[PDB]
Design a protein around this ligand. Sequence first.
Ligand SMILES: Nc1ncnc2c1ncn2[C@@H]1O[C@H](COP(=O)(O)OP(=O)(O)OP(=O)(O)O)[C@@H](O)[C@H]1O
Ligand SMILES: [K+]
Ligand SMILES: [Mg+2]
Lengths: 525, 525
Amino acid sequence: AAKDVKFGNDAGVKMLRGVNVLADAVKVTLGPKGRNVVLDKSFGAPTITKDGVSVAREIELEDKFENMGAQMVKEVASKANDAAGDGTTTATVLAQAIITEGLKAVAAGMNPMDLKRGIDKAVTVAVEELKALSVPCSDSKAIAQVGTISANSDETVGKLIAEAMDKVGKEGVITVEDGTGLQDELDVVEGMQFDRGYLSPYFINKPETGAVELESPFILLADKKISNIREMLPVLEAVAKAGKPLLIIAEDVEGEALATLVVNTMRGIVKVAAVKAPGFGDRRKAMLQDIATLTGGTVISEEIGMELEKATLEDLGQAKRVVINKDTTTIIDGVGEEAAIQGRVAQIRQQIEEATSDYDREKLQERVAKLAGGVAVIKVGAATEVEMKEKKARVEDALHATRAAVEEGVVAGGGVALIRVASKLADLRGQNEDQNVGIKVALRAMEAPLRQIVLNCGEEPSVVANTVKGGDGNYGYNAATEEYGNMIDMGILDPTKVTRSALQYAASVAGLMITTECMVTDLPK
Amino acid sequence: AAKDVKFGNDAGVKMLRGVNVLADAVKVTLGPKGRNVVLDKSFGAPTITKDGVSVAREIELEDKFENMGAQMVKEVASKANDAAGDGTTTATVLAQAIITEGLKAVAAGMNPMDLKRGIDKAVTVAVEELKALSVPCSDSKAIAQVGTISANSDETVGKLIAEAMDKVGKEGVITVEDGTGLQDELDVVEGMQFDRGYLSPYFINKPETGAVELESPFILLADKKISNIREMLPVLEAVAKAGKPLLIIAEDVEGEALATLVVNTMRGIVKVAAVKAPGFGDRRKAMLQDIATLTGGTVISEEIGMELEKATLEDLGQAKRVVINKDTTTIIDGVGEEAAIQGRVAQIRQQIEEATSDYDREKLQERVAKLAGGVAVIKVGAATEVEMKEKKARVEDALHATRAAVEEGVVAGGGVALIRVASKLADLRGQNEDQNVGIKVALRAMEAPLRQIVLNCGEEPSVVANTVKGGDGNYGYNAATEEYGNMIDMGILDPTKVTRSALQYAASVAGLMITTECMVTDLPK
Ligand SMILES: Nc1ncnc2c1ncn2[C@@H]1O[C@H](COP(=O)(O)OP(=O)(O)OP(=O)(O)O)[C@@H](O)[C@H]1O
Ligand SMILES: [K+]
Ligand SMILES: [Mg+2]
């Protein structure tokens, strides 16, 4: 259709207005004193939230160009979310800060490309510096603290997460479900859990959790790669009857075969999901067997001259339920008999005795623990369905944040880490003045998170910012108590990973907008 | 009446639009290749001109705020005109260049007061530098050359001015009056000239020169203030007869008396003009006497118990012609007898001998010079009233330009002097970045004149500017021949005085607009 086309400044003011509406709506929810945002619903009462992502999803503007600016920066939160699962609001205020000053510099006549280069250089060095300052979240105490902090100071949620990770390990699978009513519940189910997700989406039958769930399915344990569907045809049909879904746990399911499975299960033609076998090399085969012993199946390896074509429903393993995430497979309640299973345990138990290497020893103990990984399930307390659904949300977020914290060290929270980094880069320079302005734009935007947190408290941003910059190290402002102190000692930490991600995605989208010269959209008609 | 009030940016864009319309209409007339501007008349054929002042006078805009901007910058040309009588177009392009970039800097967020301070510092240093590059027009040959060139190559006008300056000295008073018909006339009258203009307009009988001219008038020399007309009645009537105009040279003519004179001479009822007596205090009386000795009059002072009522046409002085400007009175060819006059000279001549103070010595030498300086009068040739009136105008301008040339000096024309000055200030800095921006705004504006001259030629401004800046000294672009060369050798010179004035007035008005925050005007109703 006929288009409306805008250039330079005309386009710039439109974009800026669009990012401001989005960022302003989102940033009021930042930190312990975040404010509420009410989102209208077509039916019933409006939604009241302090969740940034929830607000962003609702933002769409009337002016086509302003809407483009809003949808562009909205990409910042979504990418930061996908990558770290937290810090989307932080990423949004960093982006607004960089875009605002960057566009001002452009309007002033500065070279957009140089501005972007300067911003990029500052971010590159800032990230290195962020790593240098990064400390860990390994022990259960740290995990508890981060969990508590991520749960709005709810020490309860903190303990839960810590206990759940103590059961299945901090790398294990953990889920949260509605509670039976009052008092939380934590139980490990099959069963076993290993680090391997679906070999492709679509298998996802429950987009609510973005996971795949199968009930009383058959489990094919093939010790090899599967490229040709032909091999599956015989077993797939055997499973076609008995009306039960099939879980493929092979060394890997490549294009040809995988593509077919995706299409067939897409047409209701037999429900089948595929995931890679745990580990690699030798231990892979040994582990693929542990699953067999657990599900009562039989490994189909070519090493013993076995063919998938010559595989009956008797070779297949089976369990009451199996769940698979983007990167986790959990088999709940397997058919395997305690005789075989417990016997398998005894075997591996001796393996540990004959262990001549710590590495081999560790790997073996990992198997016995799993067989004797599973899935830790957290059932949220209650006392009224409303509160129960709420606490469930908090536990979910706290878990998500703590998981991120465990993966990559931690740094002082409350926006102080970025402020310390910015101060260390005061002498950073580029190839020219415009690049230097870009560097300064980035260092200035690095104070935005702390300033917005303070602003949401009802305090003065410049005063608090000035005071924090005055000290050093982990010295920061505790917005919950409105007292200065050592952020680490007060338990206010952020996973280095979310801080880094927030900054990189903010600078990335900001750089693109700053170097945008023209915009095209449908004519308002 | 109700007002429309605008602030900041809103006011700024209006002002800018207004100066742009005025400056753009005016600047097309700059230099040897200036284009024509057609100005509509209510009757007959339109006026076609290449004269900047003529164009500026017609500019008035419909938008009240835009019109304010145009009228404001119009002040630049008028002041530059009053001070140097040339370079009003140059001053206008300089003002537009400073205003344009200055307002851009303001919109960019820079401090107006600092921008103005930087612009002012640059101009202060630029003027000093202009003086340093300034070169002489001392001998009559040079005076004749400059005069000829200023008279559109009319060697006649050049000789006239040179002779006039040879009579009364290059620092002496010189006037131009209509000729008696064919052939020019140069005669020195009492002549004498002092710094006192008409005590009010209206007396101005020749708005062409905005001056008052009287022929063979009587001169009343009253040593006191005149408030009551009664005192004049007797003498005014005595002058009513003999059909001759009257020149009142009293200590001062206050309201009552002055008001009457303005009304009567307004109705053709006796032609009379009044001007204050030269000097003040004691010397005043001594000087009032010098005029008497020159015009053959008698000072009527109350000190000797004399009354204006008891004053006959015999007491009054007389001269063939007298001319008075806004601030100058010149008595040409007085009746006084060489015996009395020369004797008076001898007296004052001894006064200088007995002088015990330099000040008293200086003041005395001033009187002898006037009485022994007079006023040279140039009566322009003729051969038809039309041509006579035209040549008179040329002589007036040429004279004005030569006068300035004699005082200072000259610099390379074609805008190169300002370009050379700008390059010499490349390292100039202020107290902060905003002041530095102001400095750059001014140095950049200094290139506008040469650029506009080139643009009017139909050539490329940036190319020529780049080439001229590449060379040094008097190297410049001859817009008439479109060849580079030594501006002085090619005879392209500007009086340092007009270049300095154009720059100072441009900067002065630009500084005011740049620091304007609010505009008030009548509601368009
Ligand atoms: N007591 C506290 N004082 C200061 N800052 C705190 C405190 N508790 C938490 N924070 C900080 O608040 C920020 C996180 O706030 P919030 O969860 O509202 O936004 P986000 O994680 O950036 O985005 P999302 O909307 O995805 O949660 C981090 O900088 C965190 O360290
Ligand atoms: K929040
Ligand atoms: Mg968060």
